[PDB]
């Protein structure tokens, strides 16, 4: 219901800001892109699509314990890499300088 | 007696630091948990063969006050060793169900008794073949707190009974 409300609210605010003045294009375009959640409505309607979504979420929660370990390990490797190659990835278009 | 006295037995031979310390920790908990309700004494005369008889009447006059009496015996390593005498304490069994943890524990407990491991394990096993009904209370817990609360709850049941 929150998703439905935010979709509707985005559409209405996008309509309201239609002043044809060009004051803000980034905001109105973002409110347009917010429409893309529109097909995401049919997953609450179809029970079997919702069942598939729940199975995917269950698998994600099943691997949530190792995902934390994974992001901790990759943070450690990222920090080691920063200690190694920080500032060294500079170059010239002229190989001689 | 008016009350059945408390007797600890089951890990291994008394007088050895393993059984002595396990029983002493349980005994200290039983002491300072029930402050003003249990009597503490150390017994060094062989009740199982009943100077020998000089202390049984001492047990009665502690057991005659409707209070729990703790028996720190130094020669009981068997429940049936006392079965012939009419003293009849509660045979509390501090049981450990696997001899391998016993052996690794004897290794862990210092250096002196490492050479006394074999006979102590043998007598512990000897007590292990004894049937459970010979004992009053079974202490199968590995944690100190769980075994302590089990024994304390049965003691509360006995207290409410008498």
């Amino acid at each position: 219901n929150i998703l439905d409300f935010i979709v509707v609210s985005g559409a209405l605010v996008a309509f309201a800001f239609s002043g044809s003045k060009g004051k803000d294009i980034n905001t109105i375009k973002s409110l347009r892109v917010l429409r893309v959640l529109r097909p995401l409505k049919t997953i609450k309607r179809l029970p079997k699509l919702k069942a598939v979504f729940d199975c995917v979420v269950n698998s994600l929660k099943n691997v949530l314990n190792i995902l934390i370990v994974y992001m901790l390990f990759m943070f450690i490797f990222a920090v080691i890499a920063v200690q190694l190659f920080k500032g060294k990835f500079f170059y010239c278009t002229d190989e001689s300088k | 007696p008016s009350m059945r006295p408390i007797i600890l037995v089951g890990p291994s031979l008394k007088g050895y630091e393993v059984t002595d310390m396990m029983q002493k920790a349980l005994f200290d908990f039983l002491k300072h948990r029930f402050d003003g309700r249990i009597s503490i004494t150390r017994v060094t005369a062989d009740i199982s063969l009943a100077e020998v008889q000089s202390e049984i009447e001492r047990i009665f006059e502690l057991a005659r006050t409707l209070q729990l009496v703790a028996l720190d015996a130094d020669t009981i390593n068997h429940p049936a060793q006392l079965s012939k005498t009419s003293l009849a304490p509660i045979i509390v069994y501090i049981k450990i169900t696997s001899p391998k943890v016993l052996q690794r524990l004897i290794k862990s407990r210092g250096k002196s008794q490492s050479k006394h491991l074999n006979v102590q394990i043998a007598a512990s096993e000897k007590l292990a073949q004894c049937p459970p009904e010979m004992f009053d209370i079974i202490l199968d817990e590995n944690q100190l707190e769980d075994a302590c609360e089990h024994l304390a709850e049965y003691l509360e049941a006995y207290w409410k009974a008498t």
Binding site: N62, V63, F77, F85, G87, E95, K97 | -
Partner: protein
């Protein structure tokens, strides 16, 4: 595009300097350990879970 990153990593002289081919060539062991851990081990860990 990991071989390109490996080439940049090995060919890195110092802070605020340009490359030098074949420099610091022992910095491939950072990219051999990383593939052993994340692409090879952890990926298959998730697939098994």
């Amino acid at each position: 595009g990991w071989p390109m990153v490996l080439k940049h990593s090995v060919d890195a002289t110092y802070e605020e300097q340009g490359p030098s081919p074949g420099y610091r060539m022992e910095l491939s062991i950072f990219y051999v350990v990383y593939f052993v851990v994340f692409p090879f081990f952890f990926v298959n860990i998730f697939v098994a879970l």
